[PDB]
Amino acid sequence: YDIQAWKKQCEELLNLIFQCEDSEPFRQPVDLLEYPDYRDIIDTPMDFATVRETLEAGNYESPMELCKDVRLIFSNSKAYTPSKRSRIYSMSLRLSAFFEEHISSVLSDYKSALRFHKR
């Protein structure tokens, strides 16, 4: 029933993601000097440092909003990859499974707590 607990839970999950080698490609913005066409394909860049800064700034209201931005990291990788067997895309899929496994209880607890609050 703690409707604020999602924020520390998301901080801790981001800490786990940053320790994970599969987050290597996703920790900071794509450099257009390395990938000159990146913004020709990707409309809305996202990375985990941006997600963490948004959280720490107090600019997420709910864990659903954070989840939308994290999912955008993964959909950007799927859109940019020239192969479904690329190194970086393959890393994105494992990291996505990890994130979804861990965010499930954060979303459930928040939605439960908020329903209780509004009862």
Ligand SMILES: COCCNC(=O)N1CCN(C(=O)c2ccco2)CC1
């Ligand atoms: C060390 O990380 C530097 C920042 N990241 C980065 O440059 N990226 C990450 C996003 N990305 C892809 O998802 C992708 C799919 C297939 C090839 O790349 C493009 C490359």
